[PDB]
Amino acid sequence: MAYPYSDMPFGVELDTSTLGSFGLGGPQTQLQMQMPAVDVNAAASGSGGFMAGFSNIFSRDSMFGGVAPSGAQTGGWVLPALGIGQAVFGAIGANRQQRAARDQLAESRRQFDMNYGAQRQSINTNLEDRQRARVASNPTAYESVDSYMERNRIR
């Protein structure tokens, strides 16, 4: 491409990860970037070529539509905007519910694993202190600590 710009490192960083992580399915990985220009200057001057400062609609006929006599009505953009917002918010809610379910499941798994770890450490301590008496009473006629720690030791 004649104008590579700097999208290659951005694409490299993105890789192929799907939605998830912790930021409602993708956090603010990038950083906030200042406004290109304080004054609108009619969008990007010649490049923009819009009517941001020229249209100045300020008319209900465009926001909410309007019907002249003899039919021939036109619809405003308010209804499409509301529909788009409805769709986006529904998708966000579904993503939130899925994330909450995943959280809950992962949390429960964490509690189970941590409880097992604590119980395992306690059991190992009990075995070690019980075997201490055996290895301190008659070391010659009994086994060593390493044998018990490597053969009858809880993982």
Binding site: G71, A72, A87
Partner: protein, 81 residues
């Protein structure tokens, strides 16, 4: 996450259906307007003009330029009536 997107797509797709229905109604009204606009021309012509077989040639040639965008069942025999 993948269950609510169906409602999103449906709500995105119904609005265009409503827009299409409105376009259909507008088109029908436009056709009616074309028909009446033509009929006014023949209604606002003096008898001597319609008798001469050069004015009516052009008058009904303006009817053959518009195609089926002009109801061709109430604009035929208009001159005779």
């Amino acid at each position: 996450g993948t269950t609510g997107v169906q409602q999103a797509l449906g709500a995105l797709g119904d609005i265009i259906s409503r827009q299409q229905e409105m376009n259909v109604n507008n088109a029908k009204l436009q056709r009616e307007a074309n028909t009446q606009s033509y009929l006014d021309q023949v209604a606002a012509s003096t008898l001597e003009q319609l008798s001469n077989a050069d004015y009516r040639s052009g008058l009904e040639a303006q009817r053959d330029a518009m195609g089926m965008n002009l109801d061709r069942a109430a604009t035929r025999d208009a001159i005779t009536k």
